[PDB]
């Protein structure tokens, strides 16, 4: 998978499981076209999101449904969601890992970019 | 100012100065209506953004132009921008401070919510 | 005015109040000697740990008792504490603001240095 | 398999490679005795610092030499190092993954604990 996501829960000290994640690609008319979606695994990852066939050059938006997640745990959080927007594969295909550490009133995101 | 922003540069160890910040409020038709904009000061803050008169209940989006910022320093970064979306004043007027710590391939955002 | 510590509670969305902060300086014998102490205010910060004249060049260790802070809320957190170790005023005086964002299993620390 | 350390370079967008990591355990005399050591791989991680049998209940200090890492790139960073101090296996065995995201004037540390 050239597009990976690792979502962690800083309150409980575990991976954030069942977190909805929607990915969009910027269309020629500057709109956001759905590209891929999934739910985080027990390890806090997205399995089978895309492949080198679909993951082409372009600007991508990765939307993490942190609100539903916290609310499912009986917690009312600050953010409506957590968004990560970046240009991908603009210099040859790459492997991208998006780390997201979650707290009800805080989130961090770190991108790791390597050669497949 | 009931809406404050503190933007830090983790590379240089200083406040992120001259960082463009655009704020939007969700309109009745789910579109993003411009609400306020500015550039961070020498202390990394936005002065005179809004007041208790305009800062009413609603969903707000705070967009930080982290890309221009890094690029101005001769650095090509990961993110297209950093976004913070949250419901404000939904339980009585509040004072919100949005902390944003910036690195070229990472950013964190923490919200501090207090009583004015 | 030269050393400021700001502690945020990433879980509740507020300043971390009444949090113990201990500062140490590295002694010639490579031991850590007490230098300053406080408890964060209602605004989660300490600003009077030291002064421009007292804060001399050296290696300082700022230690935040995050364990007690979480334990009170009935939480069993990961860290025994959060600590920042840094050389101060190595290349001349500077003002230092250390931001600490805390969660039970995560903490970040960011320094803004000026002068 | 029980203790994993993952080190990321928030500036370059990559794993922090060849980063020194030293582990210590708190001794009965309240001193820190060496327990394990390594250098992160091309993937910025260490996984073989210890084993299920060796990793007994106690207070561990994981120390990452971030200073040397930044200094090589010609950078004068804030921290002398990044260290995580925590009680392991207090309430029975657990697997521990410690994530460390590094920048010259900022580092976060997050632990994922399971079992």
We report the CATH number of the domain holding residue D76 as 2.60.40.180
Element (H, E) at A109: strand A106-114
d(CA A11, CA D18): 30
Domain count for chain C: 1
Question: How many CB atoms neighbour CB A1 within 10 A?
Answer: 17
Q: SS3 for A74? A: coil
Would you give the end-to-end CA distance of chain A in angstroms? 10
Distance CA D6, CA C110 (A): 20
CA distance B82 to B102: 9
Q: Which residue of A has its CA nearest to D14?
A: A112
- For chain C, how many helices (H) and strands (E)? 1, 9
Phi, psi of A75 (to 5 degrees): -115, 135
Per the structure block, which two tokens stand in for D91?
């309430």
CB proximity C13 to A under 8 Å: yes
Cα–Cα distance between D15 and A113 in angstroms, integer?
A: 9
> Given CB atoms, is A42 within the 8 Å cutoff of chain B?
no
Write out chain B residues lying below 8 Å of D108, CB-based. 108
B108 is in an annotated binding site: yes
Task: Please list the residues that pair with C34 across neighbouring strands.
Answer: C24
Radius of gyration of chain C (CA): 14
Q: How many CB atoms neighbour CB D18 within 10 A?
A: 12
Closest in B105, B111, B112 to A110, CB measured: B105
CA angle D5, D11, D16 (to 5 degrees): 30
Strand order in the sheet with D20-26: D32-39, D20-26, D58-64, D82-88
**Closest by CA position to B88, among listed B29, B46, B35:** B35
Q: How many C-alpha atoms does C113 have within 13 Å on its Cβ side? A: 22
DSSP letter assigned to residue A79: B
Q: Give the whole-angstrom CA distance, residue D68 versus residue A97.
A: 25
Question: Does residue B6 have a known ligand-binding role?
Answer: yes
Kindly tell me the number of DSSP H helices and DSSP E strands found in chain A: 1, 8
Using CA atoms, how far residue B91 sits from B88, B115, C30, C47, in Å, is 8, 11, 53, 32
User: What whole-number distance in Å separates Cα of residue C96 and Cα of residue B42?
Assistant: 15
Q: Is A35 left (phi over 0), alpha (psi -120 to 50) or beta?
A: alpha
Whether B110 contacts B99, CB under 8 Å: yes
CB C21 within 8 Å of CB C29 = no
CA distance D56 to C23: 31
- Report yes or no: B58 and B11 within 8 Å, Cβ to Cβ: no
B83 marked as part of a ligand binding site:
no
Q: Which three-class secondary structure string do you get for chain B?
A: CCEEEEEEECCCCEECCCCEEEEEEECCCCCEEEEEEEECCCCCECCCCCCCCCCCCEEEEEEECHHHHHHHCCCCCCECCEEEEEEECECECCEEEEEEEEECCEEEEEEEEECC
Chain A residues with CB under 8 Å of C15 CB are none
Question: In chain B, what is the greatest distance between 2 CA atoms, to the nearest angstrom?
Answer: 43
The neighbour count for residue C72, using CB atoms within 10 Å, is 9
Tokens of B49: 């953004």
- Candidates D111, D107, D59, D104; CA nearest to D82 is D107
Locate D49 and state its tokens.
């610092």
Structural domain range at position C83: 1-115
CB contact under 8 A, D11 and B78: no
Mutant choice from D8, D105, D110 vs B, greatest count of B C-beta within 10 A: D105
What is the C-alpha separation between B82 and B59, in angstroms, rounded? 17
Kindly state the tokens that stand for B32.
């993003």
3-state SS class at A37: strand
Instruction: Compute the distance between CA of residue A69 and CA of residue A65 in angstroms, rounded to an integer.
Output: 7
Q: Provide the 10 A C-beta neighbour count for residue D30.
A: 7
Distance CA C44, CA D49 (A): 37
- In a 13 Å sphere around the CA of C22, the CA atoms on its Cβ side amount to 9
Q: Which H or E element spans position A68?
A: helix A66-72
* CB contact at 8 A, A3 and A55: yes
Structure-token pair, residue D102: 């590094």
What is the biggest distance separating any 2 CA atoms in chain D, rounded to whole angstroms?
44
A 10 A CB-CB count for A82 gives: 26
The residue among D109, D6, D110, D3 whose CA lies nearest residue D56 is D3
- Closest by Cα among D77, D93, D72, D101 to D13: D101
CB pairs < 8 Å spanning A and D: 32
D66, containing H or E segment? helix D66-72
What is each CA distance from D66 to C5, C83, D78, in whole angstroms?
21, 14, 9
Q: Does A11 touch chain C (CB under 8 A)?
A: yes
Chain B partners within 8 Å of D9 (Cβ): 105
Containing H/E element for B88?
strand B82-88
Pairwise CB contact (< 8 Å): B105 & D11: yes
Mutation site for C-interface testing, chosen from D64, D90, D109, D113 by largest number of C Cβ within 10 Å? D109
């Amino acid at each position: 998978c050239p597009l990976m996501v690792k979502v962690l829960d800083a309150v409980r000290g575990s991976p954030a499981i069942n977190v909805a994640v929607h990915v969009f690609r910027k269309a020629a008319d500057d709109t956001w076209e759905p590209f891929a979606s999934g739910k985080t695994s027990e390890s806090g990852e997205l399995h089978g999101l895309t492949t080198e066939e679909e993951f082409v050059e372009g600007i991508y938006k990765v939307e993490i449904d942190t609100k539903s997640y916290w609310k499912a745990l009986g917690i009312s959080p600050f953010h409506e969601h957590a968004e990560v927007v970046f240009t991908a594969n603009d210099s040859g295909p790459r492997r991208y890992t998006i780390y997201a550490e979650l707290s009800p009133y805080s989130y961090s995101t770190t991108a790791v970019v390597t050669n497949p």
